[PDB]
């Protein structure tokens, strides 16, 4: 059968904490799992495609607001 | 003790799911709590200030890539 392909996952690592961005797909559509990983701890939220750009804008605006 | 006013918390709502952005401060400094809420489900990650801009860029770059 034909192959579907999603974008490559990426990470952002700080001192002793790592964030993984992983794209997935289900009956509802395409989503982003954002996982936080520490030595004894893994936790994640899932974000539908339709709000990714608004997520991006939200983080950038909060970043600028507190600049510094 | 010394006090600082943080930015106002905001939300993004979709079908049967709500995201909350809440600024906090702990022993590691300022962080963003991102909460995902459903009628009987609530979970969150916490993101230190120093990677907010890179989180923003990551979401925007992935959004554009799906064309
Ligand atoms: Cl594809
Ligand atoms: Cl990843
Ligand atoms: Cl996934
Ligand atoms: Cl899911
Ligand atoms: Cl909020
Ligand atoms: Cl944590």
Using left for φ > 0, alpha for ψ between -120 and 50, and beta otherwise, residue B52 falls in alpha
Q: Could you tell me the two tokens for B29?
A: 């400094």
The secondary element (H helix, E strand) that includes residue B57 is helix B52-65
Q: A38 C-alpha vs ligand 6 centroid, how far in Å?
A: 7
Of A63, A12, A47, A18, which Cα lies nearest the Cα of B63? Answer: A47
Does residue A26 sit within a domain? yes
Number of domains, chain B: 1
Instruction: Name the experimental technique.
Output: X-ray
- Does residue A23 contact residue B20 with C-beta atoms inside 8 Å? no
Query: What's the rounded Cα separation, in Å, for the pair A50 and A7?
Result: 16
Does residue B44 sit within a domain? yes
CB-nearest to B30 from A53, A54, A66 is: A66
Resolution of the entry in angstroms: 1.7
Kindly report the CATH number assigned to the domain that includes residue A25.
3.10.450.700
Query: What's the rounded Cα separation, in Å, for the pair B56 and B64?
Result: 13
Residue A43 C-alpha, separation from nearest chain B C-alpha, in angstroms: 7
Does residue A53 sit within a domain? yes
Q: How far is CA A21 from CA B3, B8, B41, in A?
A: 34, 26, 21
Q: How far is CA B55 from CA A26, B2, B38, in A?
A: 24, 29, 23
Query: What's the rounded Cα separation, in Å, for the pair B51 and B56?
Result: 9
Does residue B3 sit within a domain? no
Of B38, B23, B47, B18, which Cα lies nearest the Cα of A35? Answer: B47
Does residue B4 sit within a domain? no
Chain A residues within 8 A of B62 when measuring between CB atoms:
7, 21, 23, 32, 52
Does residue B59 sit within a domain? yes
Does residue A2 sit within a domain? no
Query: What's the rounded Cα separation, in Å, for the pair A21 and A9?
Result: 5
Does residue B30 sit within a domain? yes
Q: Which residue of B has its CA nearest to A6?
A: B66
CB contact under 8 A, A66 and B49: yes
Of B21, B67, B22, B62, which Cα lies nearest the Cα of A53? Answer: B62
With the C-alpha atoms ordered B62, A50, A32, B60, is the resulting torsion angle positive or negative? Answer: positive
Residue A64 C-alpha, separation from nearest chain B C-alpha, in angstroms: 8
**Domain span holding position B16:** 10-65
With the C-alpha atoms ordered A37, B54, B47, A8, is the resulting torsion angle positive or negative? Answer: negative
- Does residue B24 contact residue B33 with C-beta atoms inside 8 Å? yes
- Does residue B5 contact residue B24 with C-beta atoms inside 8 Å? no
């Amino acid at each position: 059968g034909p192959m579907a392909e999603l974008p490559e996952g990426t990470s952002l690592t700080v001192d002793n904490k790592r964030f993984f961005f992983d794209v997935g797909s289900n009956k509802y559509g395409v989503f982003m799992r954002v996982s936080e990983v520490k030595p004894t701890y893994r936790n994640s939220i899932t974000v539908p495609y339709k709000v990714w750009a608004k997520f991006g804008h939200t983080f950038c605006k909060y970043s600028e607001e507190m600049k510094k």
